[PDB]
Amino acid sequence: APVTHIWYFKGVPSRLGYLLDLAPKDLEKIIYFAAYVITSVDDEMRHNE
Amino acid sequence: FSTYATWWIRQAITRAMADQARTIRIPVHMVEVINKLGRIQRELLQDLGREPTPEELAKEMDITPEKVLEIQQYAREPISLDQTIGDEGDSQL
Amino acid sequence: RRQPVTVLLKALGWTNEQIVERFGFSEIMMGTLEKDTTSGTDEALLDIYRKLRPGEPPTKESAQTLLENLFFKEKRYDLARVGRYKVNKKLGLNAGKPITSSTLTEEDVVATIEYLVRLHEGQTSMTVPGGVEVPVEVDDIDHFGNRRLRTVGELIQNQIRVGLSRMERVVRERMTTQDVEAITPQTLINIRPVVAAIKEFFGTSQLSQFMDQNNPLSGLTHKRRLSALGPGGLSRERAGLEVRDVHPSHYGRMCPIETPEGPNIGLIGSLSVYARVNPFGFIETPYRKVEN
Amino acid sequence: EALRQARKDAELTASADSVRAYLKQIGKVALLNAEEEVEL
Amino acid sequence: QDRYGEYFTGAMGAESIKKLIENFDIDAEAESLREVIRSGKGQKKLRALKRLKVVAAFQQSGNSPMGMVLDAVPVIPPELRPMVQLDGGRFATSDLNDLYRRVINRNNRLKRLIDLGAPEIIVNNEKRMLQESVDALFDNGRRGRPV
Amino acid sequence: LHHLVDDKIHARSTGPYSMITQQPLGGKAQFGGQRFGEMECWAMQAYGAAYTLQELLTIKSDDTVGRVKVYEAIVKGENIPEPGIPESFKVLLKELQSLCLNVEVLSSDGAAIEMRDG
Amino acid sequence: GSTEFLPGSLTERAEFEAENRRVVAEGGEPAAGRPVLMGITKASLATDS
DNA sequence: TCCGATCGGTACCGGACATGTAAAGAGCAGACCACCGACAAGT
DNA sequence: ACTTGTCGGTGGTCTGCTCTAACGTCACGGCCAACCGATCGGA
Numbered sequence: 090a091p092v093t094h095i096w097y098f099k100g101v102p103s104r105l106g107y108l109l110d111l112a113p114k115d116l117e118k119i120i121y122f123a124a125y126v127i128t129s130v131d132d133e134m135r136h137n138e
Numbered sequence: 139f140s141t142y143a144t145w146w147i148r149q150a151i152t153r154a155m156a157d158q159a160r161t162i163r164i165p166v167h168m169v170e171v172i173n174k175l176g177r178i179q180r181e182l183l184q185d186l187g188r189e190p191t192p193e194e195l196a197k198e199m200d201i202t203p204e205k206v207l208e209i210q211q212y213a214r215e216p217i218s219l220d221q222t223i224g225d226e227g228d229s230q231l
Numbered sequence: 232r233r234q235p236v237t238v239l240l241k242a243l244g245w246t247n248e249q250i251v252e253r254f255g256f257s258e259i260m261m262g263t264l265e266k267d268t269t270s271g272t273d274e275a276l277l278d279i280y281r282k283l284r285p286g287e288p289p290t291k292e293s294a295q296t297l298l299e300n301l302f303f304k305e306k307r308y309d310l311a312r313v314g315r316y317k318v319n320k321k322l323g324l325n326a327g328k329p330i331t332s333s334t335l336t337e338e339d340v341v342a343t344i345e346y347l348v349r350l351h352e353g354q355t356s357m358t359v360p361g362g363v364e365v366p367v368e369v370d371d372i373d374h375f376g377n378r379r380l381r382t383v384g385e386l387i388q389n390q391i392r393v394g395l396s397r398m399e400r401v402v403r404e405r406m407t408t409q410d411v412e413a414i415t416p417q418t419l420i421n422i423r424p425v426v427a428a429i430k431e432f433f434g435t436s437q438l439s440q441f442m443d444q445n446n447p448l449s450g451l452t453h454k455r456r457l458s459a460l461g462p463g464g465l466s467r468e469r470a471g472l473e474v475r476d477v478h479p480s481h482y483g484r485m486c487p488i489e490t491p492e493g494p495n496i497g498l499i500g501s502l503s504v505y506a507r508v509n510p511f512g513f514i515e516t517p518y519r520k521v522e523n
Numbered sequence: 524e525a526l527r528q529a530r531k532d533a534e535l536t537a538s539a540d541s542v543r544a545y546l547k548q549i550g551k552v553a554l555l556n557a558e559e560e561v562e563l
Numbered sequence: 564q565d566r567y568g569e570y571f572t573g574a575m576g577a578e579s580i581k582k583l584i585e586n587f588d589i590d591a592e593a594e595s596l597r598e599v600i601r602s603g604k605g606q607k608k609l610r611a612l613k614r615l616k617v618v619a620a621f622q623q624s625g626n627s628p629m630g631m632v633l634d635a636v637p638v639i640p641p642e643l644r645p646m647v648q649l650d651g652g653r654f655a656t657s658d659l660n661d662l663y664r665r666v667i668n669r670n671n672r673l674k675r676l677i678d679l680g681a682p683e684i685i686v687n688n689e690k691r692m693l694q695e696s697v698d699a700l701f702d703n704g705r706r707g708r709p710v
Numbered sequence: 711l712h713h714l715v716d717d718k719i720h721a722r723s724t725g726p727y728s729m730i731t732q733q734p735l736g737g738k739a740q741f742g743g744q745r746f747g748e749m750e751c752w753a754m755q756a757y758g759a760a761y762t763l764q765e766l767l768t769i770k771s772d773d774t775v776g777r778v779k780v781y782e783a784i785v786k787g788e789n790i791p792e793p794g795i796p797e798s799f800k801v802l803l804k805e806l807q808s809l810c811l812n813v814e815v816l817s818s819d820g821a822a823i824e825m826r827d828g
Numbered sequence: 829g830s831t832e833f834l835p836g837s838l839t840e841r842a843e844f845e846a847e848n849r850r851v852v853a854e855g856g857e858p859a860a861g862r863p864v865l866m867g868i869t870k871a872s873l874a875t876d877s
Numbered sequence: 878t879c880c881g882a883t884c885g886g887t888a889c890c891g892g893a894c895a896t897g898t899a900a901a902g903a904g905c906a907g908a909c910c911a912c913c914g915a916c917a918a919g920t
Numbered sequence: 921a922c923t924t925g926t927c928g929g930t931g932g933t934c935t936g937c938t939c940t941a942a943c944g945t946c947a948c949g950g951c952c953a954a955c956c957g958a959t960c961g962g963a
Contacts, residue, residue, distance in 0.1 A: 090578070091632050092632070092698075093577045095702045095705055096702065099702075101884070101959075105580065107613060108587070116580075118537060119576070122544075122691045125573045125574065126574060126575070128574050139555075139560050141944075144941095144943085145940055146940090149939075161656055161661065165934080167936085169899090173898095173900090174899095176899060177899075184417055214654075215896090217653060218655065218657075223893055223895095224892080225893090231895070277525065285538070287533060288533045289529055289533065396949090400949095407944095423898070424897085430897060466954085468954075541692070542948090548688075549945095616837075637807065638808070643801060643804060653895070718891085736891095739892085749889070
């Protein structure tokens, strides 16, 4: 299973957080299996049905 | 379910701890012998009142008085090269 | 994190009327009580439980049991005989009674809060209800009345206590697995942890050192040495220019001359010639009483 | 009321320690008394 | 997931971060950050500055952000983590062997759990343990308690 | 006092070395060498003595081939050969690569120089 | 402006002036900078190696 | 604007070293080794 | 006639895999305790 590099997540400032515009708490919740994140959503299908 | 489950859970935990707990792996059939020797040593220590010599362990474990030395020498765990030697934090083994 | 002390007082079973009638001599306590924004007792107890143990679903009895375990039980809190004596002397509580209990009590907490508020106001005296009047003043942590001495016996006793705790854990583990009517004292007691702890202390602890044997004076001074370093003590790096000083309370108890001149200056010393040791671990010195 | 909101906030806490998170997850589900095991 | 199943996709763990990076567009994000910094002001401008710093750092070089998520863990040569036999028969270790052993044990257990078909709770716990083991290998103490 | 020269005097030309980084040991009880720390390096740099510093760092501590070549040259009477690459730098490069860092030495052309000489 | 320097960053005066000279000729609007006093630690950590 | 919290740093040489526990037990099978038969074909 | 390679067997030890049916169901052992300046994420 893929594993993130500790240097680029738990750093001050966090580089993954800056790249993805995510707060460090959100990253810690996601990558340590505490919260789900929507990777993508089909907006075209939702707007039709 | 709490009886069969208990049996299987205990077996799995014990077998895994026999395998994945030593830097130098020892087979389960010898980990059992080491544990038995330790238990017999504890019982002899309680009974005699002094530290039991290899002679007593040989009689109470129905093995040769030489295999006990090999068993005790297989139980050594390697030390770490990164442990501090002095009082401050500038020296290592 | 910080929480107003009124929440803690209400969680201890007190009400608004109790706080008003108890701390009615002050102003900061009233201001804190007006800004508590928490009424009743259950709400404050739930807030304390949420702050102390996040992530655990709270119930009614769990918070009370947690508070009792934290402060008012012998299992996980132990103000030792030294600590009990110091608290009694400082707050003027239980004057005369023998030192039997060794745990904190609500009376001690309320006395501490009252002492703090009266010290902040500026009063130089305070009498706890059902207590003896004591002066109100700040404490110097470097005073020799606030620094005690753990001798060899106390360190060995602590190691024996650790070993006995491990042995008790093993005994409790073995009690529920063996069959009743066949359990005997010798089939439950594993003596190995106790002797292991003693050996670990004598062979690993920083306070157990090789004897100096250059000359008789080396050994004599080695046995009379007071060290501030070790388990539960300071470190040679995390110690500023405050503890490495000759306090005026060292007269007749600690020598101001004999100390290492390297990086351990002031952290190691020697007993004076006439100095003794109290049963509580404090250092006593003799004086001749004069009259008229 | 306040108790339900406190419970909901407690269940949504981060709980950075892994052991605590696993204990919460296993405590989410209930047990089986005598008969549900046979059905399963 | 039950009701509106075929309308979105959600993930959990480092795979989610990998997919987000795959769908990430460096050029558009950098252009938006530049527009914000040349138009906006206040506390937004400082965050735009820092984000633009990182995004332009990734854009200038020929590398890709995908290197922040690992699919393989390199292993140092044995002579830099020696297993030597001290005189008297006692051995010695370099404290890296233990970390590598933990990583390998958790990876093998994860492989077995995935092959068996264990419930998602056990698999998620094993993946979290593998992540923690790799983090302890690279930097022991940054997150959580030291091993 | 218990500070006698008999317990203080120590000298070495060649002796035991370490394992990970092929540097001489330390201490009189192990026939070790004297540390040439960072302050001494600053003093040498201020003096302008480039060759003394280079030989001290390379052919007296880490250059595995250089040490034996220097000893042979001294014994046979030839000139001291040129220094090589210290082993500590290669150890550092391996430790950096083990952290998923792509450290590579580039020549003038722009290619990569392999460190697997031998 | 039309330089490759990221805004808010600290750049050498020589490089900044050279870039401005290269931009004003056969280019567009140059960048504007303001002198910065830096501590010893920050200046030593801001090196090019 | 104030606000807690994490994270970085703190001179040099000389010397000095190695851990303390285990709830077990059985039945079955493959592998390698130390001892041996035949047996015709090759020496 | 003696040797020699392929065939087949008995017995022994080291190593690994599988199984055992009353009922049993949500971890600890423990500090931290300097003290400075810088800085990002909150309020």
